[model samples]
Target chain A: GEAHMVDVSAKAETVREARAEAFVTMRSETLAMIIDGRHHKGDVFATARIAGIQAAKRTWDLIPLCHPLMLSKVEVNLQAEPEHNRVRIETLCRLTGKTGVEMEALTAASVAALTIYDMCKAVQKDMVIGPVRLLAKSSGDFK
Target chain B: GEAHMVDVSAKAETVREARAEAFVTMRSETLAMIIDGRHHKGDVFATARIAGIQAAKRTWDLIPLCHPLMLSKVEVNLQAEPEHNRVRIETLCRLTGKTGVEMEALTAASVAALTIYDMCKAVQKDMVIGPVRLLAKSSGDFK
Candidate 1:
């Protein structure tokens, strides 16, 4: 297939929003270590959240054939679900551009999940991450 | 905190790998438009995959405080989940560097999700994206 960047120069600019989610399943003990701040690696959620948010802004450079668009807002939320023995990550991205912002949201969630694993891998190595998906998206006239 | 790129010059280079995922939910009819290639836009999955892989490589530029690193490999997978009325996206990123590739993987998945949404939005405006998360990560001595 011919590879080329999609031209958005002719497209109209619009406010686009996207939300995505991911789950990291780990041992109950591991979850406790994170919540109790007993992990030697410092704050897991805080670090992961920053990493995810940072990644969202750089989505264009990482992906070829994607037009660089300025993102207006990127939010990463991380919560430990001890009952499920996992951590839940949700990301929301917003931008006014010719292109959509789902990539930014997805990137934020994915990086946040990996950050959790990185901070806790010293204690556990078998954590499993569940499916990541987009939850909602809206553009222009649509809410 | 002052914003500045993290210096990895002092860190030892190592092989790193990260995997991430994203999902897009839509009406069954909208899904059909993509699957049947009846949408005015061209192939949705193909475009998304390319966008994702490209995003993974340029994450550094998108996110502040991130050091640019050369990526060794990037892969994006898209699957149609008709039963769930969604499209599943998975991205894998690999690099030999002083830092982890979590951001790259996450960016890949996120951008792919956005691209899917962009391609199909003309026909369906309410498609929802599920979650974007990291599935796994390995670096340094760890496999």
Candidate 2:
């Protein structure tokens, strides 16, 4: 198969930022247990948040064909939305580079959601994680 | 030390979508001027949107450790939120695969946002881009 890649060498090094989200769904009871730290594996959200952020920062090195980006900042956060019996995870990534930082943001969100499932697998075997998406970005064109 | 890579070899093919966001802040006046296509360039938002979507589709090949995902849809949208005097861009990535499409979504958002800045740097050279954040994601649970 032939390989195709974006040529970013001629682009300017400008500030780039992106945000993304993912939801991990499970039973209401499971959510309650996770929030209360009563699950077999404790502190799942906290661990996943950290893992996700780390994943975003290391995205270039972890993935091939991605330009090594000097990320100025990266943040990952997780919150339990009781209304849906799900946990919402968000990741924000920023850098100044020729290429974009979308992959980093995506990697962060995916890893964070996966971490949640991994931590709670014992009690929530059938948890569904998905609908991971981008919320917004502000790299340019604003006042 | 231990290294673990996620396994998707046994996972069933599924459709996935991801969304992400970011914020770029500059002076209020600069923001107002941009709305009317006064950045001395073509439509800032439109160009960025396309760039983002293109970036998202290239995610799998761009990053290592990421499986080549067959993405079906990629969309990028940008909005000018006057209250914040900021331009917000979001990318939606859709695909069907044994793995997931989080990376695609993230890549789109990041690239689109970066494109906006590249197009408008001459006008707002000192713009501060920050608070790029993710809003939500929906998949198996929401579907």
**Top-lDDT structure, candidate number:** 1
- B94-140 in candidate 1: lDDT tens per residue? 88877888767766776787778766766765665545556788733
Scored against the true structure, residue B70 in model 2 reaches a CA lDDT of: 74
Q: What would the TM-score be for candidate 2 when compared with the true structure? A: 0.49
Query: Candidate 1: lDDT of B123?
Result: 74
Task: Please provide the root mean square deviation of candidate 1 (C-alpha atoms, Å).
Answer: 5.8
* Model 2 chain B poorest ten-residue lDDT run: B134-143
Residues A8-123, candidate 2: write the lDDT tens digits: 77887677887777788878988888777655444677667777777677665544445677788888988899999888888888877666666677678766776676556446
Worst 10 residues of 1 chain B by lDDT: B1-10
Give candidate 1's whole-model lDDT: 0.74
Q: Model 1, stretches more than 4 Å misplaced?
A: A1-21, A38-41, A59-73, A91-106, A122-143, B1-27, B38-41, B58-73, B77-114, B121-143
DockQ by candidate, in order: 0.18, 0.04
Superposition error at B70 for model 2 (Å)? 0.9
